[PDB]
């Protein structure tokens, strides 16, 4: 009877975020983690994937889907190596950070 | 705070995967089945009287609820009986095998989260 409380608000958040932003709660968790890794500088993709797999317990393919979606929705940025084509970095620019803050202020208020 | 909700996101997603793999049930199905235990453990309940209750208690659409109820019945975790007089009228109920399945399932949930 204490689990249902959690379930209602979780389901409620998931629908709200989906409707308003077309993001899943996986995308949010991934985006949250990007803030801890590439706020000030860029980070290599293959690296971020291992960190994220361990910390979020998501498959590599679920992570790639989320990262690609965040980039597509202009909430995360990507830069390739001029040296090695197969090497990709992700990073948050200033627009991305301002979007991030707006999004999570919106998250906190929906929950509170 | 945010470590506790990201924390809870992990356990939540972990539970959903486990239940889906092992039972082919969603967490919606679980919430609905939990609610059935509070309404039709000892007697049957009219489908209408249940959909409204559940809609209010679980904040789910009538259609999401019909999907779950139908799935629970197909998975032999919930039972259904029709009126003989009005074909339109349907009841749901938990029989003794259903209750036994219910207990096994929730014991499994409770231990997975601990």
Q: What is the DSSP string of chain A?
A: --HHHHHHHHHHHHHHHHHHH---HHHHHHHHHHHHHSSSS-EEHHHHHHHHHHHH---HHHHHHHHHHHHHTTSSEEEE-SS-TT-EEEE--HHHHHHHHHHHHHHHHHH-
Contacts of B58 in chain A (CB under 8 A): 4, 8
d(CA A37, CA A48): 8
Question: H helices of chain B, where?
Answer: 2-23, 27-39, 47-58, 62-74, 96-112
Please tell me which of the candidates B9, B31, B113 has its beta carbon nearest to residue A7. Answer: B31
- DSSP 3-state assignment of B5? helix
- DSSP 3-state assignment of B6? helix
d(CA A52, CA A39): 15
Q: In chain B, what is the straight-line distance between the N-terminal and C-terminal CA atoms, in Å?
A: 20
Instruction: Give A84 to chain B, closest Cα distance, Å.
Output: 35
Token pair belonging to B80: 């259904």
Contacts of A9 in chain B (CB under 8 A): none
Resolution of this deposited model, Å: 2.0
Q: Please name the residues in contact with A13: beta carbons below 8 A apart, sequence gap of 6 or more.
A: A25, A107, A110, A111
Q: Identify how the structure was determined.
A: X-ray
Token pair belonging to A81: 């190596």
- DSSP 3-state assignment of B26? coil
CB A24 within 8 A of CB A18: yes
Please tell me which of the candidates B9, B13, B59 has its beta carbon nearest to residue A12. Answer: B59
Contacts of B34 in chain A (CB under 8 A): 4
Strands laid side by side in the A77-80 sheet: A43-44, A88-91, A77-80
Chain A positions touching chain B (beta carbons under 8 Å): 3-4, 6-8, 10-12, 25-26, 29, 32, 56-58, 111
Q: Do B59 and A11 touch (CB under 8 A)?
A: yes
Please tell me which of the candidates B9, B14, B28 has its beta carbon nearest to residue A25. Answer: B9
Q: Do B31 and A4 touch (CB under 8 A)?
A: yes
**Residue A42: half-sphere exposure toward Cβ, Cα within 13 Å:** 12
Q: Do B8 and A4 touch (CB under 8 A)?
A: no
């Amino acid at each position: 009877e204490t689990l249902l409380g959690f379930y209602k608000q979780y389901k409620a958040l998931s629908e709200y975020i989906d409707k308003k932003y077309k993001l899943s709660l996986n995308d949010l968790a991934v985006l949250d983690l990007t803030m801890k890794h590439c706020k000030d500088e860029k980070v290599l993709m293959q690296s971020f994937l291992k960190t994220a797999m361990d910390e979020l317990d998501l498959s590599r393919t679920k992570l790639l889907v989320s990262i690609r979606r965040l980039i597509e929705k202009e909430r995360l940025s990507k830069v390739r190596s001029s040296k090695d084509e197969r090497k990709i970095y992700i990073y948050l620019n200033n627009d991305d950070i301002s979007k991030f803050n707006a999004l999570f202020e919106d998250v906190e208020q929906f929950l509170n």
